[PDB]
Amino acid sequence: QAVTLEALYAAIEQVLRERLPEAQLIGFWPGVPENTPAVSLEIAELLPERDPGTGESALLCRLQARIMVPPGADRQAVSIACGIVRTLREQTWNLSLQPARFVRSAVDGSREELKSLRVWLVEWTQSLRLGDPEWAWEDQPPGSLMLGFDPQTGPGHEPDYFAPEAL
Amino acid sequence: SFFHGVTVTNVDIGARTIALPASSVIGLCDVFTPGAQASAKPNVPVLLTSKKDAAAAFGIGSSIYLACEAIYNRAQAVIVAVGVETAETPEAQASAVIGGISAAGERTGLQALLDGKSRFNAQPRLLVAPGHSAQQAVATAMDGLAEKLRAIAILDGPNSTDEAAVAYAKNFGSKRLFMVDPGVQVWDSATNAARNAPASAYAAGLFAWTDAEYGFWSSPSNKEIKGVTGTSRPVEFLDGDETCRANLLNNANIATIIRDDGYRLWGNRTLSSDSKWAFVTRVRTMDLVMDAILAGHKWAVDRGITKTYVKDVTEGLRAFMRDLKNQGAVINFEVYADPDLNSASQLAQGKVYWNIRFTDVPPAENPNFRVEVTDQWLTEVLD
Amino acid sequence: IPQTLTNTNLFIDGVSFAGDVPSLTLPKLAVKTEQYRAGGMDAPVSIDMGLEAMEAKFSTNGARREALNFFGLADQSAFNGVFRGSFKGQKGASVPVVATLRGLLKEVDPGDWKAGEKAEFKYAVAVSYYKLEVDGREVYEIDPVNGVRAINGVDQLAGMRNDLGL
Amino acid sequence: IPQTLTNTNLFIDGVSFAGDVPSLTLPKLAVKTEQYRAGGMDAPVSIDMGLEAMEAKFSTNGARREALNFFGLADQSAFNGVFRGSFKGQKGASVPVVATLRGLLKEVDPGDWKAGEKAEFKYAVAVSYYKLEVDGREVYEIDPVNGVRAINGVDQLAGMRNDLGL
Amino acid sequence: MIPQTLTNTNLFIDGVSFAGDVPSLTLPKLAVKTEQYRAGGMDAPVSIDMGLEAMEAKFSTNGARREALNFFGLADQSAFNGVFRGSFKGQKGASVPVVATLRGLLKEVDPGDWKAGEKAEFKYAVAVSYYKLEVDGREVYEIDPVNGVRAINGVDQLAGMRNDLGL
Amino acid sequence: MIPQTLTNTNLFIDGVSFAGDVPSLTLPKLAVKTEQYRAGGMDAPVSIDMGLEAMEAKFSTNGARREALNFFGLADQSAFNGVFRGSFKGQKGASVPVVATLRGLLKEVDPGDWKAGEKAEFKYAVAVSYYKLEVDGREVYEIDPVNGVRAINGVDQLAGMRNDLGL
Amino acid sequence: MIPQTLTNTNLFIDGVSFAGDVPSLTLPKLAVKTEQYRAGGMDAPVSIDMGLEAMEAKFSTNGARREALNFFGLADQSAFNGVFRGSFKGQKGASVPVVATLRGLLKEVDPGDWKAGEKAEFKYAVAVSYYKLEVDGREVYEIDPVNGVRAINGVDQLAGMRNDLGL
């Protein structure tokens, strides 16, 4: 029914392994740039949105992809980066979401270790309605309604009438 | 083949009696003889709109056609009628009018008018048995057909005197039966004879006429029947609390037909011992607003109205009650939350009891003129 | 204490638009006033004449077919709809406000379609019947025809229909 | 769930403007209402009179000659055009919306030419025939002449043309 | 005094309520047939009352109110009966009713121009004979032309000149 | 009652539909030739019906509707036949038809000023003889001048004063 | 039918085109001299055709169109010849021409007020004798006063009452 963040992490890993065979390893929280064409997904920031009228909390998450590559293969990482951007134009990751909004793609300087020097941040935002809807007003089912009249009114004699009856 | 170009014909048209295209639906069960001309099996229902279907589905030598002409002289309605096959024994003729589910998937007699639903979305609102309502076992099953349909049935007292009719109607305490006693003779345009019609389909077209014009809330009593001559026996209405024949028939709740010819009806009451639902205009508005609950439940069940059911039905009911206040059918309308709701866990789990009160428009029965002859203004004029 | 709204639901004919109704505007109720200065006065007093018209403007953001199909019907007061809301203030006492209305859906406005944004259709209903219950009991009940302008239970035109015979 | 639009195509006479149509605006459909308060009422009910006019405003960004040449023709309803769109919501179920229209291309507006920007011509068609199919089946079918105002299949003026003999 | 205006209006014809389509009424303009009179020994004429003149009471509806079209030009003149109700709410709450019973000849049915997108406005007119206006149930005007009844506020203003003509 | 106005309109002339160019109609103003009557023993005159007066039924078109220009000033007066249809939709859906069969002399073709950038508006007028208005198929007015037919709602209002003139 | 209006206009006088200065025309209002007729045995008069009346065909120009001022008040009445052309384009393309040949007396030159900053608008008027309107080349009106020619749609409507006066 409703979405979960673990349901979101599994489907973005799932589709990106199909479309990118040159990307050897697309993990959602890995480390250790063990080999050349690696892509490490992240989470940058999850922000509020226009709250819908139910119990779901609207959140747009700045999803983030980091394309790890040894230096000297910068062009080989833009071709990985162009593969991610062409995905994000219509992609809902098959999970009842809104299509993801692409934000930017550029080379950054990480706080982390730089043995694999060249990394390309590819970040995008997509809205989430996490959680269950919550009903608040009235919980009176169709099985409970009796409709009397003016003389058939009172705690002495009950209004002997159901709403599903004869024709 | 065909014919080209205009054609003039020596022909016979019998004096056009066109009426208003009414909206209410009439059920009817009377007896005829099937032939090759009458293109209808007996115990199957068929809707009729004009006299072309009462001459082709049923024969003109019939007794449905005596009563379909009775409606179509008065108000063009939609009659769903069945045929009872012709019997000779006076019980076996009436026992085929009643019938049952003797067939496999078919009801035969009066019960075949239950097939008005699921077939055209047009139930009968009136139930007519011309002449056969003098027998009790027919009239008691008119009640049993009215309770299943919410459709007031027009009965027929015997064509004998008043005490044959007042003492006939003592066993009826039913809310939906409406009795018209004095039989009506109507002079036929072919056989030179005042045909003694049973006079219960004359009131059926009148109820169709008042619904199409003056509405259902107006009591269909002082309205004029057309295409009609005098009654089979004369009644009268005179004043002074005497034994006059119209007052003798209202107090035992029988309609009467008053003036020169079969002009007007006279009954305002129905055959209810319970004086709350004595007026026919109250039972026909009660059985109309009980149908809006049904269509207000069918609309509140096919769209998954789970948590907001009672709010969807009740406001949708008051959408119909403000219509009746708009049309003049009611004066007060109020859908009340009754104080017989004991505890919150008890009431929300089951048994929410709400009410519907409405003050129907009372028909003006017995206006009263307190009349004088004075000496006051004799001085001012002469002097 | 102020009342932050928390929950929002809109019905059209029973179908739950709980969720994608981002904006909704109830009709502003305006008395038809008139600046009236007669002889023995200087500043104009204002006199009621009834209400003016009532437009409610919600804006769903999908190609609906469950709200689109109530445009241009042959009968007014066929679109009805029921709003449900929930203001939450004063120690979690969420007051249930409902605002059920009725009338002709007088305008369906699809916005600019710049190939990639949301839908955000816009709607406007010329409200005839308007019923606002704040915390269960009645506040505003405005039926224009039959003159049933009723404030918190009492009918302010009860003295008028006795004069007019309605 | 809201419906983010994904694909946009515009035809004029069959020629694919798939691509360079950055903005497009379907006609807002407005019922010709009238604030009507008669005798026995206080608030004005609103009564349909038909629709008002329909302008659709797309804005291509090239010197076209395939959309320019439908301005000022001697016959109205010669420019027709067919829009095609695709809202995508509820687990990739992209609903195909088309909005085919017809009418006089009433205005061709070339913008400011500040020597180095895009073109961005602007257009406006006084729509006569308007047909909106959301997910295959019909929603709005508005033919002004012959009075064929039809909502989701049923003709709301079927009772009118029998009265007028059309 | 309180500021008191017209707010709402109603029209009955033979009991039938026009609760849905009356945009306008017009009560009959009661005017004295003033004959200005300057004679020997005065100036600046003094305007002797000669009597009233004809009393047309226009109104209009914009539907097919056939129950109002049936009363045009019948054989029985003064068979159109009808009241022109109307309530004046004032400022202090309770509304003061004004009703106006009419009895005359519907001498004009004026269907408007049908501009196909505007209203209809079947403008009517009744040259009334009988005329009775009430205010809060209290009598102000009895105007009966034939048999000489002009009763202003209940007291008959032609009774002194009716017991000399011998009517 | 329901709020009910005019929405759409149509005009036929000898069967030919004017479904494309009629901006306006005008039904004939039915008015009684009222002669105000004050006599001895009354005041405030009582307006005896004398009969109707002439019934011009204007309309206008703004095209070259030559099928409407051919009926001007023919040798056969009362050879212009035509109906003035029109439907009143009300508020509760189903529309109430109003048709008006005419038979008269097209006594006026008034072509408008041709301001070269505005409409045309060929304003017409028919001094009708025969006149039959219907509402929802029900009869209200039969106005035939010659041979004395004034039938209001089907019952003839001149039949009592036609079997004494011996017509 | 198609929606069809007036778009453009032209005026010729003795062949000379007024292609540059005609802001307005006016075709002559063809009207029958209706004499309303109520006699013994009827009511609601029946409007016998007596003939037409005078046909002034106004127009205006706002330049010094001396070629239009030369035709005022000549010795030869009915020497002003001229057509009032005009095309009705419709909706489906091809335009339906309406021309109107005139022959009358230019009985009025009305120079406007010269407010020195507005237009001129020399308003004219021709009391025409001869009058021939065409629609798409097809004849509708021949109105010749003298020698008795009223030919509606080509068939002469006074020929039956011209071979009895012996004209």
Sequence ranges of the domains in chain B: 13-273, 274-362
- Neighbouring subunits of B (3+ Cβ pairs under 8 A): A, C, E, F
Both tokens assigned to F167 = 């017509």
Query: Cβ–Cβ contacts within 10 Å for residue D125, how many?
Result: 25
For residue G113, how far is the Cα from the chain centroid?
A: 26
List the one residue out of D152, F90, D54, D42 whose CA is nearest residue C104.
F90
Q: If you count them, how many residues does chain F have?
A: 167
A19-47 burial code (b ≥16 CB/10 A, e <16): ebeebeebebebeebeeebbbbbeeeeee
From the list D2, D88, D91, which residue is nearest A90 (CB)? D88
| Separation of alpha carbons F136 and B212, rounded Å | 12
Query: For residues G14 and F128, is the Cβ–Cβ distance under 8 A?
Result: no
> Does B20 lie at the interface with F, CB-CB under 8 angstroms?
yes
> Does F135 lie at the interface with B, CB-CB under 8 angstroms?
no
CA distance from start to end of chain D: 43
Residues of A in contact with D5 (CB under 8 A): none
Q: Is the dihedral of CA B193, B196, B201, B205 positive or negative?
A: positive
Q: Tell me the technique behind this structure.
A: cryo-EM
| Nearest chain C Cα distance for residue D4, angstroms | 4
List the one residue out of A148, C163, E25 whose CA is nearest residue B337.
A148
By CB atoms closer than 10 A (0-12, 13-18, 19+), residue C49 is middle
Q: Which residue of A has its CA nearest to C93?
A: A136
List the one residue out of B352, B317, B319 whose CA is nearest residue B338.
B352
Residue recorded with tokens 């075949």:
B112
Alpha carbons within 13 angstroms on the beta-carbon side of residue E162 total 17
Both tokens assigned to B76 = 């063009």
In this structure, are strands E80-88 and F24-26 parallel, antiparallel, or unpaired? unpaired
Contact call for E163 and B326, based on CB within 8 A: no
Q: Which residue of G has its CA nearest to F11?
A: G1
Both tokens assigned to A41 = 């997904």
Torsion of CA E71, E73, E76, E82, to 10 degrees: 30
From the list A142, A148, A158, which residue is nearest B306 (CB)? A142
| Separation of alpha carbons C63 and D5, rounded Å | 10
Q: Beta partners for C154?
A: C151
Query: Cβ–Cβ contacts within 10 Å for residue B186, how many?
Result: 23
| Nearest chain E Cα distance for residue F136, angstroms | 9
> Does D4 lie at the interface with A, CB-CB under 8 angstroms?
yes
Residues of B in contact with A165 (CB under 8 A): 294
Residue type, A58: A
The DSSP letter of residue B216 is T
| Separation of alpha carbons A17 and G135, rounded Å | 76
| Nearest chain C Cα distance for residue F4, angstroms | 11
> Does C82 lie at the interface with B, CB-CB under 8 angstroms?
yes
By CB atoms closer than 10 A (0-12, 13-18, 19+), residue B91 is exposed
Torsion of CA B316, B317, B321, B327, to 10 degrees: 60
CA C129 to each of CA B300, D46, D59, F3: distance values in angstroms, whole numbers, following the listed order: 20, 12, 41, 15
Q: Which helix (H) or strand (E) holds F81?
A: strand F80-88
The total number of structural domains in chain A stands at 1
Q: Beta partners for B46?
A: B81
Q: If you count them, how many residues does chain E have?
A: 167
By CB atoms closer than 10 A (0-12, 13-18, 19+), residue C152 is exposed
Mutate to test the interface with C, among B308, B309, B332, B334 (most CBs of C within 10 A): B308
Q: Which residues contact C16 (CB under 8 A, 6 or more apart)?
A: C9
| Nearest chain F Cα distance for residue C102, angstroms | 13
From the list C50, C146, C163, which residue is nearest E97 (CB)? C163
Contact call for F3 and C74, based on CB within 8 A: no
Both tokens assigned to D80 = 């027709």
Mutate to test the interface with A, among D1, D8, D86 (most CBs of A within 10 A): D1
* C144 phi and psi angles, rounded to 5 deg: -65, -60
Contact call for F110 and G32, based on CB within 8 A: no
Helix (H, G, I), strand (E, B) or coil at E86: strand
Resolution of the entry in angstroms: 3.8
The DSSP letter of residue A130 is E
Q: Per-residue DSSP letters for B259-303?
A: SSSS-BB---B-S-SSGGG-BHHHHHHHHHHHHHHHHHHHTTTTT
* G38 phi and psi angles, rounded to 5 deg: -115, 120
Q: Which residue of E has its CA nearest to B328?
A: E17
Query: For residues F63 and G5, is the Cβ–Cβ distance under 8 A?
Result: yes
> Does A56 lie at the interface with C, CB-CB under 8 angstroms?
yes
| Separation of alpha carbons B241 and B247, rounded Å | 8
Residues of F in contact with D38 (CB under 8 A): 3
E strand residue ranges, C71-120: 82-88, 94-110
List the one residue out of F115, D114, E89, C33 whose CA is nearest residue G7.
F115
Torsion of CA B206, B207, B211, B212, to 10 degrees: -30
- The H-assigned helical ranges of chain G are 66-69
Query: For residues D25 and D81, is the Cβ–Cβ distance under 8 A?
Result: no
For residue B130, how far is the Cα from the chain centroid?
A: 12
| Separation of alpha carbons E28 and A18, rounded Å | 88
Angle, helices A74-87/A5-19, rounded to nearest 10 degrees: 120
| Separation of alpha carbons C122 and A96, rounded Å | 24
CA-based Rg of chain F, rounded to a whole angstrom?
19
Q: Which residue of E has its CA nearest to D51?
A: E117
Residues of D in contact with A90 (CB under 8 A): 6, 88
Mutate to test the interface with D, among G4, G89, G91 (most CBs of D within 10 A): G91
| Separation of alpha carbons C126 and D80, rounded Å | 32
Helix (H, G, I), strand (E, B) or coil at A120: strand
List the one residue out of B80, B78, B79, B32 whose CA is nearest residue B58.
B32
- Neighbouring subunits of F (3+ Cβ pairs under 8 A): B, C, D, E, G
| Separation of alpha carbons B285 and B176, rounded Å | 12
Contact call for B148 and A138, based on CB within 8 A: no
For residue G89, how far is the Cα from the chain centroid?
A: 21
For residue G51, how far is the Cα from the chain centroid?
A: 16
From the list F7, F20, F93, which residue is nearest D50 (CB)? F7
Query: For residues B265 and B223, is the Cβ–Cβ distance under 8 A?
Result: yes
* B34 phi and psi angles, rounded to 5 deg: -75, 145
Contact call for F137 and B326, based on CB within 8 A: no
Residue recorded with tokens 């509405």:
B215
* B171 phi and psi angles, rounded to 5 deg: -85, 0
Q: Which residues contact B236 (CB under 8 A, 6 or more apart)?
A: B244, B245, B246, B258
Query: For residues A122 and A85, is the Cβ–Cβ distance under 8 A?
Result: yes
Both tokens assigned to G163 = 């071979």
Q: Per-residue DSSP letters for B64-117?
A: HHHHHHHHHTT-EEEEEEEEEEP-SSTTHHHHHHH--S-SSS---SGGGGGGGT
Q: Which helix (H) or strand (E) holds E66?
A: helix E66-69
Query: For residues D87 and C115, is the Cβ–Cβ distance under 8 A?
Result: no
Q: How many CB pairs under 8 A join D and F?
A: 50
Helix (H, G, I), strand (E, B) or coil at E110: strand
Q: Beta partners for B155?
A: B179
| Separation of alpha carbons G50 and G61, rounded Å | 35
Query: Cβ–Cβ contacts within 10 Å for residue E15, how many?
Result: 9
Q: Which residue of E has its CA nearest to B325?
A: E19
| Separation of alpha carbons C107 and C72, rounded Å | 9
Q: Which residues contact F156 (CB under 8 A, 6 or more apart)?
A: F142, F149, F150, F162
Q: Which residue of C has its CA nearest to F93?
A: C75
F98-118 burial code (b ≥16 CB/10 A, e <16): bbbbbbbbbbbbbbbbbbeee
Query: For residues E139 and F62, is the Cβ–Cβ distance under 8 A?
Result: no
- Bin B315: left if φ > 0, else alpha if -120 < ψ < 50, else beta: alpha
In this structure, are strands F16-17 and F6-13 parallel, antiparallel, or unpaired? antiparallel
Contact call for G89 and D74, based on CB within 8 A: yes
Contact call for C69 and D135, based on CB within 8 A: no
> Does E70 lie at the interface with B, CB-CB under 8 angstroms?
no
| Nearest chain F Cα distance for residue B290, angstroms | 21
List the one residue out of C128, C124, C93 whose CA is nearest residue C109.
C124
Mutate to test the interface with B, among A134, A140, A162, A165 (most CBs of B within 10 A): A140
Instruction: Please work out, in degrees rounded to the nearest 5, the angle formed at the alpha carbon of residue D59 by the alpha carbons of D55 and D60.
Output: 140
Both tokens assigned to B103 = 């067939």
Query: For residues D3 and C65, is the Cβ–Cβ distance under 8 A?
Result: no
Alpha carbons within 13 angstroms on the beta-carbon side of residue C70 total 22
Residues of D in contact with F25 (CB under 8 A): none
Contact call for A138 and C96, based on CB within 8 A: yes
Query: For residues D36 and C145, is the Cβ–Cβ distance under 8 A?
Result: no
List the one residue out of B223, G5, B321, E68 whose CA is nearest residue F119.
G5
Q: G and A: touch, per 3+ CB pairs < 8 A?
A: no
Contact call for F93 and C77, based on CB within 8 A: no
| Separation of alpha carbons G40 and G21, rounded Å | 56
From the list G89, G91, G95, which residue is nearest D77 (CB)? G91
Q: Which residue of C has its CA nearest to A132?
A: C19
Q: Which helix (H) or strand (E) holds A127?
A: strand A118-130
> Does B304 lie at the interface with C, CB-CB under 8 angstroms?
yes
Contact call for F107 and G153, based on CB within 8 A: no
| Nearest chain E Cα distance for residue D114, angstroms | 45
Sequence ranges of the domains in chain C: 1-166
CA B304 to each of CA B165, B309, C15, D76, E47: distance values in angstroms, whole numbers, following the listed order: 53, 9, 8, 48, 79
For residue B237, how far is the Cα from the chain centroid?
A: 24
B200-221 burial code (b ≥16 CB/10 A, e <16): bbbbbbbbbbbbbeeebbbbbb
